[PDB]
Design an enzyme around this catalytic site. Sequence first.
Site, PDB file in Angstrom:
ATOM      1  N   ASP A 241      -0.381  10.996  19.235  1.00  0.00           N
ATOM      2  CA  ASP A 241       0.540  11.136  17.783  1.00  0.00           C
ATOM      3  C   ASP A 241      -0.595  11.571  16.988  1.00  0.00           C
ATOM      4  O   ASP A 241      -0.608  11.074  15.734  1.00  0.00           O
ATOM      5  CB  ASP A 241       1.142   9.830  17.463  1.00  0.00           C
ATOM      6  CG  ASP A 241       2.173  10.063  16.660  1.00  0.00           C
ATOM      7  OD1 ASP A 241       2.595  11.112  15.991  1.00  0.00           O
ATOM      8  OD2 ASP A 241       2.422   8.955  15.773  1.00  0.00           O
TER       9      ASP A 241
ATOM     10  N   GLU B 286       5.010  -3.008   7.755  1.00  0.00           N
ATOM     11  CA  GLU B 286       4.354  -2.964   6.416  1.00  0.00           C
ATOM     12  C   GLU B 286       2.770  -2.663   6.546  1.00  0.00           C
ATOM     13  O   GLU B 286       2.138  -2.837   7.707  1.00  0.00           O
ATOM     14  CB  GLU B 286       4.505  -4.067   5.756  1.00  0.00           C
ATOM     15  CG  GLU B 286       4.597  -4.140   4.316  1.00  0.00           C
ATOM     16  CD  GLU B 286       5.394  -5.167   3.977  1.00  0.00           C
ATOM     17  OE1 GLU B 286       5.333  -5.773   2.491  1.00  0.00           O
ATOM     18  OE2 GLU B 286       6.478  -5.783   4.402  1.00  0.00           O
ATOM     19  N   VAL B 287       2.314  -2.132   5.564  1.00  0.00           N
ATOM     20  CA  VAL B 287       0.832  -2.245   5.195  1.00  0.00           C
ATOM     21  C   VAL B 287       0.260  -2.677   4.027  1.00  0.00           C
ATOM     22  O   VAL B 287       0.920  -2.159   2.942  1.00  0.00           O
ATOM     23  CB  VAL B 287       0.233  -0.543   5.462  1.00  0.00           C
ATOM     24  CG1 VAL B 287      -1.044  -0.614   5.648  1.00  0.00           C
ATOM     25  CG2 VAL B 287       0.803   0.148   6.840  1.00  0.00           C
TER      26      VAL B 287
ATOM     27  N   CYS C  65       7.653   1.559   7.103  1.00  0.00           N
ATOM     28  CA  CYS C  65       8.977   1.843   7.923  1.00  0.00           C
ATOM     29  C   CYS C  65       9.038   0.940   9.446  1.00  0.00           C
ATOM     30  O   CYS C  65      10.058   0.768   9.946  1.00  0.00           O
ATOM     31  CB  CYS C  65       9.096   3.417   8.224  1.00  0.00           C
ATOM     32  N   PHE C  66       7.729   0.893   9.812  1.00  0.00           N
ATOM     33  CA  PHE C  66       7.654   0.051  11.132  1.00  0.00           C
ATOM     34  C   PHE C  66       7.343  -1.441  10.969  1.00  0.00           C
ATOM     35  O   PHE C  66       7.095  -2.368  11.789  1.00  0.00           O
ATOM     36  CB  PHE C  66       6.586   0.577  12.269  1.00  0.00           C
TER      37      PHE C  66
ATOM     38  N   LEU D 146       0.935  -1.189   0.155  1.00  0.00           N
ATOM     39  CA  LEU D 146      -0.095  -0.030  -0.002  1.00  0.00           C
ATOM     40  C   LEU D 146       0.655   1.314  -0.110  1.00  0.00           C
ATOM     41  O   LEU D 146       0.730   1.979  -0.719  1.00  0.00           O
ATOM     42  CB  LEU D 146      -1.033   0.083   1.102  1.00  0.00           C
ATOM     43  CG  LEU D 146      -2.221  -0.645   0.554  1.00  0.00           C
ATOM     44  CD1 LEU D 146      -3.506  -0.220   1.555  1.00  0.00           C
ATOM     45  CD2 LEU D 146      -2.169  -0.072  -0.871  1.00  0.00           C
ATOM     46  N   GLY D 147       1.780   1.431   1.037  1.00  0.00           N
ATOM     47  CA  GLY D 147       2.068   0.287   1.945  1.00  0.00           C
ATOM     48  C   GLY D 147       3.275   0.360   2.611  1.00  0.00           C
ATOM     49  O   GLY D 147       3.921  -0.252   3.156  1.00  0.00           O
ATOM     50  N   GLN D 148       3.835   1.899   2.728  1.00  0.00           N
ATOM     51  CA  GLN D 148       5.126   2.358   3.554  1.00  0.00           C
ATOM     52  C   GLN D 148       4.704   2.380   5.092  1.00  0.00           C
ATOM     53  O   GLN D 148       3.888   2.922   5.616  1.00  0.00           O
ATOM     54  CB  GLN D 148       5.409   3.680   3.150  1.00  0.00           C
TER      55      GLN D 148
END
EC number: 2.7.10.2
Length: 255
Positions: free
Chosen positions: A122, A24-25, A21-22, A17-19
Site C-alpha cells: 500500500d 482515529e489518529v 476512517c479506520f 490530527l486525525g482522519q
Amino acid sequence: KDAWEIPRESLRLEVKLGQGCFGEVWMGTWNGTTRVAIKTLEAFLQEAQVMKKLRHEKLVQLYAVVSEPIYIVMEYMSKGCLLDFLKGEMGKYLRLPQLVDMAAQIASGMAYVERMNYVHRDLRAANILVGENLVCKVADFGLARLPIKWTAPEAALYGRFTIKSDVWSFGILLTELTTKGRVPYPGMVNREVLDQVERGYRMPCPPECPESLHDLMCQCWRKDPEERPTFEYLQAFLEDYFTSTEPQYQPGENL
C-alpha cells in the site's frame, strides 16, 4: 503480553490530527515526557505486529501497543500525510531538488523493507508521513507481509504481491511527487486503467519532469515484475540524481 505493551495510563491523547476512517489518529504525550502519535480503533494491530520486526530511520517507528480500546503509539510526524503536504500550501514551493530528495528517502525506507524480505503492498503518497526538514517516512504497514491505480497489474489481478509490486507503486508515487499530489491516470476510472495498463499504456512525462526521471518511472512499470529496479538502485539513483543524471538541471515554473 510482550514487551511492546504499555499501560494506557502512560498515554495522554490530546489533539485529533486525525482522519479518521479506520478508527482515529491523535497527537499525544507518552510517560509525560515523549511527544507521540497514538492511533485508535481486533487484529489491527497487524500493522503493529509487522512494525515490531521493522526498524529504519525512514519508516515511522512503533513505540508501544495495547489490548479494545486498542491503541498503537508511534513516532510523531509533525507535517502529516505527504499527499496533503504536496497538495496543501507547502506544495507550490517544492521544486525537483526537494521532491527528488523526498523520493530518495522513501526509496531508502523501501530499500530497508526490501533487505528485510517484506512487501509493503500500500505504497503511495497517502502512506508517507512528513516531519521537520522535509523528512519522509514510510507509514501504514497495516497490509504488510512477509487502490489499483498504485497496484502493479499482477498484484491487482492475481494477488501476486512482491517487493517488485511495491516498485511499481513507487513509480506511481513518483508521479504524485512530480504533480504535487494529483491522482494518477487523470480522468481514468479504475476499470479503464486496468484494461489500458494491461494493453501497455503508461502515464506520460509530467509537465516539467525531466525525461530521465520519467524513464525511471517507466522502468518501475515494466510488465515483467522481475525486470523492475530494486529499491537499492532507486535509492542510489535518486540520491545522486543532480550530479550523475541531471547535472544541467535548471529550475522551471513548477519543478
